[PDB]
Structure 1
Amino acid sequence: PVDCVRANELCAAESNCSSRYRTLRQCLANKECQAALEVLQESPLYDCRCKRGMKKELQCLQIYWSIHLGEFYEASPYEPVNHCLDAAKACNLNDNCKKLRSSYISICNREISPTERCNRRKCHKALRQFFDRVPSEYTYRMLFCSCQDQACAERRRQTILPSCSYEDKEKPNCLDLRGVCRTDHLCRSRLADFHANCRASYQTVTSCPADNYQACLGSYAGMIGFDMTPNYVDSSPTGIVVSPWCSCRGSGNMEEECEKFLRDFTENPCLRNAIQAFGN
């Protein structure tokens, strides 16, 4: 398994491979394209992955999407691997979780104007830095904690602090938000990571591919801190339905694909069964 950084390392160590890589990069960014394709289908850049929380993930993804030829699903460039009161108490007794926790809270709970509720990009940056370098027995315990009443569900909803990040003035079109997320490098890669690990299945007994709860939970929580950042819909104790901040309105004749894209978050038996079995 060769990641794209070392694939560029072996690419820059050779003359023909670097020539065909820069040739295809000048093609994308007939006959010049097809020869570069039939050469670089044997490159170490061909089928290179990236890692979660690796150093210079952005360059790895910019290299990986550079060789990609120009669509509901895409290939993931990654390695295919009171209760909530007690979760917060287990965080605040460790030192690494406490510092970054107070970091994203003291950033995201700063009202600026009576119009601007909070700063968006710094709050997303703090949430990404929280959900990258914290051990996952702390994140999953605070974000997924089994509740029986309304106050526990409200604490669990308020954990990613949706008053700044999740909600907006309007609910835009889900397809437009998908286009915005697929414009950016990082959000498109996290969305493909979520699509590769959290589809429904008719063959496996838990409707999840490879019967892997862990990959679908990591593909869920890796979408926090982007524009396609989901959260719960209400403070329901047992009813657990996640959703991004959009809706099916404004769809036109593209209504069915919008509904099918939204049913990945609203009506996934794989993700809901994974959350329920993790709560058990």
Structure 2
Amino acid sequence: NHCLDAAKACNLNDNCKKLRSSYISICNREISPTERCNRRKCHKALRQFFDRVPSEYTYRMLFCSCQDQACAERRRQTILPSCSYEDKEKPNCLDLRGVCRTDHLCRSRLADFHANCRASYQTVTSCPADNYQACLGSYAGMIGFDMTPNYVDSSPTGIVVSPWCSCRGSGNMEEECEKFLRDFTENPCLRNAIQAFG
């Protein structure tokens, strides 16, 4: 499958292989029965991987086409989500957005994502200027911050991505929260950009 092919290209490149193994070994290391990993360290290693390995390797792993579950599960596992994505606490998306916005880089990366993956009702791709690449890059640029998005399950073609948060407990800001969340979950520009990558 394309996701296996992507892992191969990475492992056969010295720099990709090193930076891949580094995030894998940190993110996969259990601390105690109650703590799945050192999350902060895992996120840092993820950031380094996406910052210091070219997109030709990196996007191919993250956005590889799948026809079956085996491939889609591999794709879902790219960021090692049981460490980097999931948590026993599922925060409110607007609270999580607040946490992201205290970090200079997360704030800027989220803003890039909102701008570059903005759904247009006027363009053939639903992306601004039909620029798929800038949307994909902005998606990838959020991994390892406190707005880390991921594939929600191992659906092969029915792709749904989201941060680990919900809009329950929003009080009177429920509409605001769900609109924010839909930039990830229900965005035709992002959908089309990922699908067009192959």
Which category of TM-score, normalised to the shorter sequence, fits these structures? Answer: over 0.9
Distance 1:138 1:114 in 2: 34
Distance 1:246 1:135 in 2: 29
TM-superposition CA deviations, 1:68-121 (whole Å, max 9, x none): xxxxxxxxxxxxxx1111111111111111111111111111111111110011
SS at 1:274 equivalent: helix
Distance 1:149 1:191 in 2: 31
TM-superposition CA deviations, 1:115-152 (whole Å, max 9, x none): 11100111011001100011101001111111111111
SS at 2:51 equivalent: coil
Distance 1:102 1:183 in 2: 29
Q: Which has the higher contact order (CA 8 A, sep 6+)?
A: 2
RMSD of aligned C-alpha atoms? 0.8
Q: Given the two structures, how large is their TM-score scaled by the length of structure 2? A: 0.98
Distance 2:156 2:18 in 1: 30
TM-superposition CA deviations, 1:210-261 (whole Å, max 9, x none): 1100110111000000010000111111100100000110011111111100
Distance 1:222 1:106 in 2: 21
SS at 1:175 equivalent: helix
Identity %: 100
Structure 2 spans left out of the alignment, 5+ residues:
none
- Aligned residue among 238, 244, 247 for 2:157: 238
- Aligned residue among 118, 124, 136 for 1:217: 136
SS at 1:263 equivalent: helix
Equivalences, count:
198
Distance 2:54 2:104 in 1: 25
Distance 1:171 1:106 in 2: 25
Distance 1:111 1:274 in 2: 35
Distance 2:173 2:119 in 1: 22
Distance 2:20 2:178 in 1: 35
TM-superposition CA deviations, 1:157-198 (whole Å, max 9, x none): 011100101000021100100111112211111111111111
Distance 1:111 1:275 in 2: 32
Report which of the two has the higher share of helix: 2
SS at 1:238 equivalent: coil
1:97-246 to 2 correspondence within 5 Å? 97-246=16-165
Moved segments of 4+, more than 6 Å: none
Distance 2:102 2:17 in 1: 34
Distance 1:159 1:179 in 2: 26
SS at 2:65 equivalent: coil
Q: Given the two structures, how large is their TM-score scaled by the length of structure 1? A: 0.70
Distance 2:161 2:93 in 1: 14
TM-superposition CA deviations, 1:10-43 (whole Å, max 9, x none): xxxxxxxxxxxxxxxxxxxxxxxxxxxxxxxxxx
What is residue 4 of structure 2 aligned with on the other side?
A: 85
Distance 1:189 1:168 in 2: 24
Distance 1:246 1:257 in 2: 14
Distance 2:16 2:109 in 1: 23
SS at 1:164 equivalent: helix
Measure how far apart 1:275 and its partner are. 0.8
Distance 1:138 1:145 in 2: 11
Measure how far apart 1:204 and its partner are. 1.1
SS at 1:264 equivalent: helix
